[PDB]
Design a binder for this molecule. Structure first.
Ligand SMILES: Nc1nc2ccccc2nc1N1CCCC1
Length: 154
């Protein structure tokens, strides 16, 4: 009863890359890069493809850092989001009709213009912790309840 999704954060020692969606899913918020996984495609392969297609970057090594399940009250399908980190990229991010990438110093993460769950798990990602999480939403701006715990293996 869930659909697989990937989310990739390009995290360097002093900055992180986010992209502003110009429309569709996530318009007007800063997002990591990702999307649905294809049939016959592993999750790690889906994440590499999604990062490259949406940001224009080429990634060597991806590290699995978390798994987050999203429930939207009333919607049957859960979103099972597999979160990845990387610091080994080649290229320059590309702005397209769909996405506007920007680098953010770690102290200037725009949490007020991101999703409400990001304020909870993003700090774990930034200090190299792995996590498993669950968030129940009503709409897109209200967390009804949640769980989030640090783990040794994702
Ligand atoms: N992190 C996200 N939180 C959301 C909360 C409510 C509604 C939608 C959301 N989308 C998110 N992300 C976009 C790509 C994966 C994570």
């Amino acid at each position: 009863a869930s659909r697989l999704y990937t989310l990739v954060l390009v995290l360097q020692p002093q900055r992180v890359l986010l992209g502003m969606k110009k429309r569709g899913f996530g318009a007007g918020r800063w997002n990591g890069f990702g999307g649905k996984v294809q049939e016959g495609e592993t999750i790690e392969d889906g994440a590499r493809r999604e990062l490259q297609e949406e940001s224009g970057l080429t990634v060597d090594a991806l590290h699995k850092v978390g798994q987050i399940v999203f429930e939207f009250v009333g919607e049957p399908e859960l979103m099972d989001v597999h979160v990845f980190c990387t610091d080994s990229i080649q290229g320059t991010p590309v702005e397209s009709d769909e996405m506007r990438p920007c680098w953010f110093q770690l102290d200037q993460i725009p949490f007020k213009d991101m999703w409400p769950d990001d304020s909870y798990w993003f700090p774990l990602l930034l200090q190299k912790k792995k996590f498993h999480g669950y968030f129940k939403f009503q709409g897109q701006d209200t967390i009804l309840d949640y769980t989030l715990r640090e783990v040794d293996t994702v």
